[PDB]
Design a protein around this ligand. Structure first.
Ligand code: NAD
Ligand code: ADN
Length: 467
């Protein structure tokens, strides 16, 4: 019945990855609580689960939690540089299909996404774990291409869209109507990150969303923990391993002051950096002012700034024109999305600019006047591409949300639309992580609960409370 199938860099790394997974398990009380609560009953028993999410040690604990509660799983990474090859080998060695390695080409990246989606002839996932929406995109675009085949000849100059179109042309030639066949079996997708959730709301607004979606990013125990304190840890780690640069006394520019930018600026400040924030939103800008940061434009900073971190989810933050005017050896990295926050394509196609590799994921771009910039991870996620991403404890919060979302998509009735988990579940995720930290929660008396108008067991806040 069950065939072994995987594609990883180096299976001899499996034992090392398995040791790191065992360490991570002891840092992830929320995921272990999910195994303890659901491991016998197996609410996801036999349910086909496709995952597209950074193949890290932390993700390995999520995969094997979903497996412990019954899932029939296939996995790929959502980023060409974020896979930890030893974690991928350890997952493959424990007989879960995984198609992921550090340093994929874009063609390989999309081929792995397709491998993780296709469970068999005319068979796809019933649940999807997604991070950034690329697996969701492939399914929606393949479905659309059955009705509108001309979109597969339209890339709009974008090389990656050409790659996706070529893949979908081949898929639909091999299995005509594949996506209209498998889409009715998809019970839903749970989406990890701000950018992927933006794609979901856009599809829902246009009425093109094909199945229910849980916005996991906007659990309070995800957005206000992972995005902030995960980055506070892992931006520093990515910069350290890539460059070993001392931050103290350096002028560091954080582009964007949402949840990611807030955690990045706090990390930099704690290491003695002079932190500058850029923002388009006057509210987030005023928050940066109240925290003691200087709020400027990128243009204002070019003559003096030492390091640039893009954290916007937007494009064209750091342009070729900017980089021409930067100080020599300025470090440029992206912790937001994709690879277009920095104009890497412009760097690579500007005839006078010479690219010189320093070490893996660290590249010098030398300009005719003799100054250079240092680009990290080809402009992709620096925390995951140059280091190991967020640490396990905070990913346990994000991934406990993922696990509860998966169970809910399977067990509960959803209409097509985008949903968030109930506040009582959000509160439960937080509860599951308090004991490990030694925190002791206060219990309301009956009189106190009446006075503020809540059930003593929650939820404790109005639905639009912002924390
Ligand atoms: N690397 C990681 O581990 C990690 C973790 C969580 C989220 N993310 C990603 O980080 C990105 C940001 O996430 P978030 O949750 O902070 O989103 P967010 O919406 O809360 O914050 C982004 C901010 O960027 C600002 N911004 C937009 N365009 C700008 C521009 N041109 N110049 C300056 N500022 C601009 C917006 O005003 C906004 O406040 C997303 O792509 C998200 O998916 C990455
Ligand atoms: N070690 C990590 N393992 C898995 N996912 C991570 C890790 N660090 C950050 N991420 C996720 O990557 C997303 C961005 O693609 C963030 O929303 C975050 O949840």
């Amino acid at each position: 019945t069950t065939t072994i199938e995987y594609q990883v860099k180096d299976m001899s790394l499996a034992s090392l990855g398995r040791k790191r997974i065992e360490m991570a398990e002891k840092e992830m009380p929320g995921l272990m609580a999910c195994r303890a609560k659901y491991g016998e009953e197996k609410p996801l028993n036999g349910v086909r689960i496709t995952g597209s999410l950074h193949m890290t040690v932390e993700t390995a604990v999520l995969i094997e939690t979903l497996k412990a509660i019954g899932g029939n799983i296939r996995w790929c990474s959502c980023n060409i540089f974020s896979t930890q090859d030893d974690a991928a080998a350890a997952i493959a060695a424990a007989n879960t299909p995984v198609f992921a390695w550090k340093g994929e080409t874009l063609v390989e990246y999309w081929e792995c996404t397709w491998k993780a989606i296709r469970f068999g002839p005319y068979q796809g996932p019933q649940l999807i774990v997604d991070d950034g929406g690329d697996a969701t995109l492939l399914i929606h675009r393949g479905f659309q291409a059955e009705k509108e085949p001309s979109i597969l000849d339209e890339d709009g100059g974008v090389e990656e869209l050409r790659i996706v179109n070529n893949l979908l042309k081949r898929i639909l030639k091999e299995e005509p109507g594949f996506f209209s066949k498998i889409v009715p079996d998809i019970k839903g997708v749970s989406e990890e990150t701000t950018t992927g959730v933006h794609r979901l709301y856009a599809m829902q607004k246009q009425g093109t969303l094909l199945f229910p979606a849980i916005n996991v990013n906007d659990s309070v125990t995800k957005s206000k923990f992972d995005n902030i304190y995960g980055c506070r840890h892992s931006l520093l780690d990515g910069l350290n391993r890539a460059t070993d640069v001392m931050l103290a006394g350096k002028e560091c520019v954080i582009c964007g002051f949402g949840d990611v930018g807030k955690g990045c600026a706090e990390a930099l400040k704690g290491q003695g950096a002079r932190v500058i924030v850029t923002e388009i939103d006057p509210i987030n800008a005023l928050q940066a002012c109240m925290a003691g940061y200087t709020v400027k434009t990128v243009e204002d900073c070019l003559a003096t700034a030492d390091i640039y971190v893009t954290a916007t989810g937007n494009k064209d933050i750091i342009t070729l024109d900017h980089m021409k005017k930067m100080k020599d050896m300025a470090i440029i990295c992206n912790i937001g999305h994709f690879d277009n926050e920095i104009d890497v394509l412009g760097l690579k196609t500007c005839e006078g600019v010479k690219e010189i590799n320093i070490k893996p994921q660290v590249d010098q771009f030398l300009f005719p006047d003799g100054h250079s910039i240092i680009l990290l991870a080809q402009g992709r996620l620096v925390n995951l591409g140059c280091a190991t991403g967020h640490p396990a404890f905070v990913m346990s919060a994000s991934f406990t949300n993922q696990t509860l979302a998966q169970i809910s998509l399977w067990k509960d009735k959803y209409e097509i639309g985008v949903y968030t988990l109930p506040k009582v579940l959000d509160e439960e995720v937080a509860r599951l992580h308090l004991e490990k930290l030694g925190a002791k929660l206060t219990k309301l008396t009956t009189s106190q609960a009446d006075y503020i108008g809540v059930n003593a067991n929650g939820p404790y806040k109005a639905d639009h409370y912002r924390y």
